[PDB]
Enzyme design. Sequence first.
Site, mmCIF file in Angstrom:
data_model
loop_
_atom_site.group_PDB
_atom_site.id
_atom_site.type_symbol
_atom_site.label_atom_id
_atom_site.label_comp_id
_atom_site.label_asym_id
_atom_site.label_seq_id
_atom_site.Cartn_x
_atom_site.Cartn_y
_atom_site.Cartn_z
ATOM 1 N N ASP A 43 0.890 -1.072 0.163
ATOM 2 C CA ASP A 43 0.254 -0.356 0.077
ATOM 3 C C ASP A 43 0.786 1.441 0.252
ATOM 4 O OD1 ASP A 43 0.890 -0.852 2.522
ATOM 5 O OD2 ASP A 43 -0.502 0.858 3.324
HETATM 6 C C1 LIG Z 1 9.055 13.808 16.429
HETATM 7 C C2 LIG Z 1 7.343 14.414 15.642
HETATM 8 C C3 LIG Z 1 6.623 14.911 15.957
HETATM 9 C C4 LIG Z 1 5.260 13.320 15.697
HETATM 10 C C5 LIG Z 1 3.763 13.750 15.873
HETATM 11 C C6 LIG Z 1 2.785 12.897 14.543
HETATM 12 C C7 LIG Z 1 1.835 12.762 14.841
HETATM 13 C C8 LIG Z 1 0.764 11.110 14.263
HETATM 14 C C9 LIG Z 1 -0.385 10.381 14.777
HETATM 15 C C10 LIG Z 1 -0.850 9.542 14.009
HETATM 16 C C11 LIG Z 1 -1.881 10.045 12.378
HETATM 17 C C12 LIG Z 1 -2.953 9.898 12.549
HETATM 18 O O1 LIG Z 1 -3.352 8.907 12.749
HETATM 19 S S1 LIG Z 1 -4.161 10.820 10.471
HETATM 20 C C13 LIG Z 1 -6.300 10.156 10.557
HETATM 21 C C14 LIG Z 1 -5.876 10.147 8.940
HETATM 22 N N1 LIG Z 1 -7.326 8.736 8.525
HETATM 23 C C15 LIG Z 1 -7.724 8.523 7.038
HETATM 24 O O2 LIG Z 1 -7.019 8.740 6.126
HETATM 25 C C16 LIG Z 1 -8.368 7.734 6.910
HETATM 26 C C17 LIG Z 1 -8.800 7.360 5.884
HETATM 27 N N2 LIG Z 1 -8.362 6.373 5.623
HETATM 28 C C18 LIG Z 1 -6.761 6.671 4.020
HETATM 29 O O3 LIG Z 1 -7.540 7.644 2.983
HETATM 30 C C19 LIG Z 1 -5.726 6.321 2.893
HETATM 31 O O4 LIG Z 1 -6.363 4.342 3.202
HETATM 32 C C20 LIG Z 1 -4.575 6.077 3.760
HETATM 33 C C21 LIG Z 1 -4.470 6.124 5.000
HETATM 34 C C22 LIG Z 1 -3.937 7.590 3.473
HETATM 35 C C23 LIG Z 1 -3.129 4.944 3.448
HETATM 36 O O5 LIG Z 1 -3.542 4.806 1.508
HETATM 37 P P1 LIG Z 1 -2.513 4.062 1.125
HETATM 38 O O6 LIG Z 1 -2.140 2.829 1.711
HETATM 39 O O7 LIG Z 1 -3.299 3.389 -0.623
HETATM 40 O O8 LIG Z 1 -1.837 4.657 0.686
#
Ligand SMILES: CCCCCCCCCCCC(=O)SCCNC(=O)CCNC(=O)[C@H](O)C(C)(C)COP(=O)(O)O
Lengths: 88, 104, 69, 178, 459, 56
Positions: A43
Site C-alpha cells: 500500500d
Molecule cells: C516527533 C515528531 C512529531 C510526530 C507527531 C505526529 C503525530 C501522528 C499521529 C497519527 C496520525 C493519524 O492517525 S491521521 C488519521 C487520518 N485517517 C485516514 O486517513 C483514514 C482513511 N484512510 C485513507 O484515506 C488511506 O487509506 C490512507 C490512510 C491515506 C493510506 O492510503 P494507501 O494505503 O492507499 O497509501
Amino acid sequence: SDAPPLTLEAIKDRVLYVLKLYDKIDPEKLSVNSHFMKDLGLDSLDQVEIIMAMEDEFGFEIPDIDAEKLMCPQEIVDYIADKKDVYE
Amino acid sequence: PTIRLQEDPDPEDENLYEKNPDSHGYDKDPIVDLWNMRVVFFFGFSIVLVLGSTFVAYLPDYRMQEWARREAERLVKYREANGLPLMESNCFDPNKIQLPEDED
Amino acid sequence: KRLFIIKPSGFYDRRFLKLMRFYILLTGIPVAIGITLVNVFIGEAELADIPEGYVPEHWEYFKHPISRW
Amino acid sequence: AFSAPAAYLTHQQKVLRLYKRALRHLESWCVHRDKYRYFACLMRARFDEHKNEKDMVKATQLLRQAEEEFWYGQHPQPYIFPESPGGTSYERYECYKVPEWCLDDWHPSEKAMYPDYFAKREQWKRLRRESWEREVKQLQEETPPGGPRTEALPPARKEGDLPPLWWHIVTRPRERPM
Amino acid sequence: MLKIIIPTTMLLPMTWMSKHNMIWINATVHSLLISLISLSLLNQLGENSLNFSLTFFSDSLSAPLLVLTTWLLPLMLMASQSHLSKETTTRKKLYITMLILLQLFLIMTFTATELILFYILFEATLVPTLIIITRWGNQTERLNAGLYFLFYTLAGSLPLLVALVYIQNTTGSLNFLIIHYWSHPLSNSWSNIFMWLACIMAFMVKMPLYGLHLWLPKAHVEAPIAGSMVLAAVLLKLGGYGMMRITTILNPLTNYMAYPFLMLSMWGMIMTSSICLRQTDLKSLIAYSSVSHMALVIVAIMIQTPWSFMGATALMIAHGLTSSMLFCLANTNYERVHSRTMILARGLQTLLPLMATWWLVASLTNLALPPSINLIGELFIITASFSWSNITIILMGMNMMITALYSLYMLITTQRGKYTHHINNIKPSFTRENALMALHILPLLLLTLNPKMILGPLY
Amino acid sequence: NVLQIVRDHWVHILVPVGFVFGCYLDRRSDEKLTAFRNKSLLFKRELRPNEEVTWK
Ligand SMILES: CCCCCCCCCCCC(=O)SCCNC(=O)CCNC(=O)[C@H](O)C(C)(C)COP(=O)(O)O
Ligand SMILES: CCCCCCCCCCCCCCCCCC(=O)OC[C@H](COP(=O)([O-])OCC(O)COP(=O)([O-])OC[C@@H](COC(=O)CCCCCCCCCCCCCCCCC)OC(=O)CCCCCCCCCCCCCCCCC)OC(=O)CCCCCCCCCCCCCCCCC
Ligand SMILES: CCCCCCCCCCCCCCCCC[C@@H](O)O[C@H](CO[C@H](O)CCCCCCCCCCCCCCC)COP(=O)(O)OCC[N+](C)(C)C
Ligand SMILES: CCCCCCCCCCCCCCCCC[C@@H](O)O[C@H](CO[C@H](O)CCCCCCCCCCCCCCC)COP(=O)(O)OCC[N+](C)(C)C
Ligand SMILES: CCCCCCCC/C=C\CCCCCCCC(=O)O[C@H](COC(=O)CCCCCCC/C=C/CCCCCCCC)COP(=O)(O)OCCN
C-alpha cells in the site's frame, strides 16, 4: 579524489539490495520490473517507507510530488540516474 | 490602418564580434578599431599614467617642508642652547602693540 | 573520464590584461632603469653653506637630481 | 521538481506527506537506528489505527489534530540532506553552472582546441533548428482553445518528432559541472 | 593658464576638420595630451597661490579639480563612442563639441580670479549639459529632467548674482585676493542674514543639499553615460569649490547660520543612504550615493576648520573618480540588456569575471576602505566634526554602516547568485570597457601613495 | 608620397601649436607685471656684474 561516477548497473544493484532487505517483499520473486502495489501487494505507506529507504541509500532526498509515482524499481533507477546525471 | 503613423521597426543591435571575432569594441572597421585600441593604451597607460606619476613623484619641494624642518632645527638648537623658551605665547612683539589705554 | 568544461570565453579578458601589462611595462621599465642609473651614478646633492657673495640658482635649492632638472 | 503540480492535494497526499515528515522528525529525535526503528514501527501502527475510516469529516479532524501535534513536537533542528533546500551544500555548485549558449561567443582560437566537441555541437544545433516548428505546431494541436490547463507537456507521437520544449531540459549544465 | 586653455580650444576645430572615421581617435589622443600638460599645475608654492595673471590663478584647492576635469574628458570619449556608433558624422562632431565646450568652461571657472567671471563660467556650464541630457538622453523623461536641472540651479544662482554686484558696490572689488586681504566681519543683522543666504544657496543647490536634491536623480539617471560621468565627477564639485571660496567674507555669521544646513546634511546623509537600500533602478542607487557623499562635504565646509577643509578636498576628488567608475560599470550592463532594473540581470560574475573584479574594486572604494583616499577624506571630516561636537559620531557612525550595506547589496545583487536563464546576449567584455575601468581605478590607487596632492591649500 | 597623408593628418598640429602659442602668451602676460621686479623687501638683490633682470 572522491567517489567514482555512478553507473546505472551499480544503481540498480543497490536498489534491488534495499528491496530484498525489505520484509514485505519476496526476494525469490522480486524483479526490476515488479510493480509495488499491483504485483507485490503493498500500500501507499509501504511505498513511502521504500522511498525513505532509497534516500537513506543514496544520500539525497526525493521530493514528495515526484515520488508519488515511483511504483517499480526501474522507475527508481531512472529517477536516480536522471537526477545524478548518469547515462551508463 | 488601425495604425497611427508610418514608422521604421526598432532594429536589433549588431554584435561587433560577429564580423570581427577580435574586435576590441572600438569601431566596426578592424583597422581603425585596432589603432584606436593602440592609441588609447599608449597615451593613457604609457604616457600619462607612468610618466605623469613619475613627474608628480619627483616634484621639487616648492611647498618648503624641508626648508621648514631645517629652520625649526636651527631655532630649537639656538633656543635651548641659550635656555630660552621653545615657543612664546605671543606671535607678535608686545612692544609694537598699542592697546587702548584705559579699560574701564 | 575527461569531460568538457563549459566556461565563458576567457580570451578577451586575458588579451586585455596582456595588453595593459605590455604598455605599462613598455614605458615603465625604462623609467625604472633610468631612475636606478641616476641614483647610482649621479646621486643626491649634499647640504653646503652659501659661499661668500654667491647667489645660487633657483634649482640649486633642491637635492634630488631629477627634482633639480 | 520534475512533475507538473496539480491544482490541489488530495486528503491521501496530505496524509502521506504528514507520514513522511513525522517519520523524518522522529528519526531526528531518535538518533540511533534501533530506537528509531522501534518508535517508527509504533508510529506506523498509530497511523494504521485509523486506516479504514469512512467518515471524511472525522478523518479530516484526525489529520488536523495530527498536524497540530507534529507542529508542537517537531524537531527545531531536523536532519537535512546536504543538497536539499536547507542543506549545507544546497546551492554550492551553482557558481560553476554556465549556460551552453556561452560557447558561441568563444574566440575561434578557443574553438580550435576541441574540434570534435564543436562539430557535434553544430549537429545538435541543426537538430534543434529542424525540430522547432514541428514542436510549436504539435503544441498548438494538442492544446485546448482556452489555453493549457496544467503544466504538463505531451511527448512526441510521430516518427522523427522530439518532445516539444526539450532543449533547455536536455541541455542542462550538470549538477557537478566542474 | 593660457598654455592649458588654448589647446583645449584647438580641440574644437581639430574635431571639426577631422575625417569621419577618425574623430574619436583624434579627440582621445589630444585630450590625453592636454591632461598630461595640466598635470604640471600640481607644483604649488606653499604660502600662496600661483598667480599667472590678473585673470587666472591656480591653487592647491584648484589644481586637483583641473586635473580631474582634463582626465575625465578622454574617459567620456571612450564611454560615448559605443552608443553613438549609429549617429551621423555631424551629430557626433556636435556631441564632441558639447563635451569640449564643457571642459573649457570648467577649466576657466576654477581659475578665474574674481567672482563675476567665476559666476559667468559657473553658469555657462549649464548650456552644454542641458543640451547633452535633452538631445542624447535615451528616455522620454529626459525633457523633464532637463527642466529640473535648469530651474533648480537658476533659482539659487540669481540671488547670488544680486549679492555679488551689491558686494562689489560696497567693497569696491570682487577679486578673490583683495576679498581675502580686506575681509571684515559680517554683523548680525537681517540684511547680513539675507546676504549670507544669497551667497550660500546657489552652492547649496549645486552640491546638492538634502531637500533641494530632487533634480539630481532625474538628471543623473536620464542623461547619456558621458553626461552622467561629468555631472557626478565634476559638476557637483562646483558647489564645494564655490562655497570654500565664498565663506571668507561670511565670518563670523557662519557660526550660527550653518545650523540648519548642518542638520539637513547629517540627517539627509542618513536618509539618502537608507533610500539606496530600497532602489529598483541601478543608476538611481549611484545617484543617491553621490548625494550622501556630498552631504558629508557640506558638513565639512560648514564647520570651517583646516582638517575639515582638507577632508572635503580629498573626498571631492575621490568621489569624482569612484562615482564616474560606478556609472560606467552600470552602463556596460545596460548596453547588454537594455534595462536599468537591478534584478533583471543576476549572477554576472559567472559570465564576466574581470568586470566583476572592477565591480568589487569600485564597491570597495565607495564604502571607503583604508587606505583609499575616500576614507582619508571621510576620516578627516569625521574627526573635525567630532571636535565640533562629540555627538556627531553617532550620525557619522550610522552613515558608515548604511553605506557598506547598500554598496555590498548592489555588488551581491548584480554579480552573485545565478544568471537569469532567459538572457543569452551577454557577450564578453570589450577591451574598451576594461580599459575604461582601469583608467578610472589606477589613478585612485596611485593617489594613496601621495595623499598631500589632493589635500588642498590648508595642508 | 606625403601629399595626401598630409592632407588627411594635418589636424594633428592644431593642439601642439595651440600649446606653444599659449606658452608664448603666458610669457607676454608675465611681461606686463614687472612693476615690482627686484623691488620687494624680501627678495630685493644686487644685480650680478652682467645680468640685466632678476627674472624675465
Ligand atoms: C516527533 C515528531 C512529531 C510526530 C507527531 C505526529 C503525530 C501522528 C499521529 C497519527 C496520525 C493519524 O492517525 S491521521 C488519521 C487520518 N485517517 C485516514 O486517513 C483514514 C482513511 N484512510 C485513507 O484515506 C488511506 O487509506 C490512507 C490512510 C491515506 C493510506 O492510503 P494507501 O494505503 O492507499 O497509501
Ligand atoms: C604592472 C603591470 C600591471 C599594472 C599594475 C599597475 C601598475 C601601475 C603603475 C603606474 C605607474 C607608477 C609610476 C610611479 C613611479 C614612482 C617612482 C618613485 O616614486 O620612486 C621612489 C624611490 C626613488 O628613490 P629616490 O627617493 O629617488 O632616491 C633616494 C636616494 O637618493 C636613492 O638611494 P641610493 O641611490 O643610495 O640607492 C641606490 C639605488 C640602486 O640601488 C642598488 O643598486 C643597490 C641596492 C642594494 C643591493 C644590496 C644587495 C645587492 C648586492 C649583494 C650581492 C652582490 C655583492 C656581493 C657579491 C660577492 C659576495 C661574496 O636605489 C634604487 O634605484 C632603487 C630602485 C628604484 C626603482 C624605482 C622604480 C619606479 C618605477 C616607476 C614606474 C612604475 C613601473 C612599474 C613596473 C616597473 C618594473 C617593476 O624608489 C623606491 O621607493 C624604491 C622602494 C624601495 C623599498 C625598500 C623596501 C621597503 C619595504 C618596507 C615596507 C614593507 C614592509 C612590510 C609591509 C607589510 C607586509 C605585510
Ligand atoms: C595585475 C597584477 C598585479 C600584481 C603585480 C603588482 C606589481 C606591484 C604593484 C605594487 C607597487 C607598489 C609601489 C609603491 C609605491 C612606491 C613609490 C611611491 O613611494 O611613490 C609615491 C609617489 O606616487 C606618485 O606621487 C603618484 C602620483 C599620482 C599619479 C597620477 C597619474 C596621472 C594623473 C592621471 C589622472 C588623475 C585624475 C585625478 C587627479 C586628481 C610616493 O613617493 P615618495 O615616498 O614621495 O618618494 C620619496 C623619494 N622621492 C620623493 C624623491 C621620489
Ligand atoms: C528644504 C530645504 C530648503 C533649504 C533650507 C533653507 C534654510 C533657511 C533657514 C535660515 C536659518 C535661520 C535664519 C535667521 C537666523 C535666526 C532666525 C530667527 O528665528 O532667530 C531669532 C529672530 O527672532 C524671531 O525669530 C524673528 C524671526 C521670525 C520670522 C521668520 C519666520 C520663520 C518661520 C519659518 C518659515 C520657513 C522659512 C524657509 C522657507 C522654505 C533670533 O532672535 P533675534 O536676536 O531677535 O534676531 C537676530 C537678528 N537680529 C540680530 C537682526 C535682531
Ligand atoms: C532652487 C532654490 C533656491 C532658493 C534660494 C532662495 C534664497 C536666496 C537667498 C535670499 C535671496 C534674496 C537675498 C537678496 C540678495 C542680497 C542683497 C543684500 O544683501 O542687500 C540687503 C537687502 O536685503 C534684502 O532686501 C532681502 C530681503 C528679501 C527680499 C526677497 C525675499 C525672497 C525670499 C526670502 C527668503 C528666502 C531665502 C532662503 C530660501 C532658500 C531656498 C529654499 C541689504 O542691503 P540694504 O537694502 O542696503 O540694507 C541696509 C541699508 N539699509
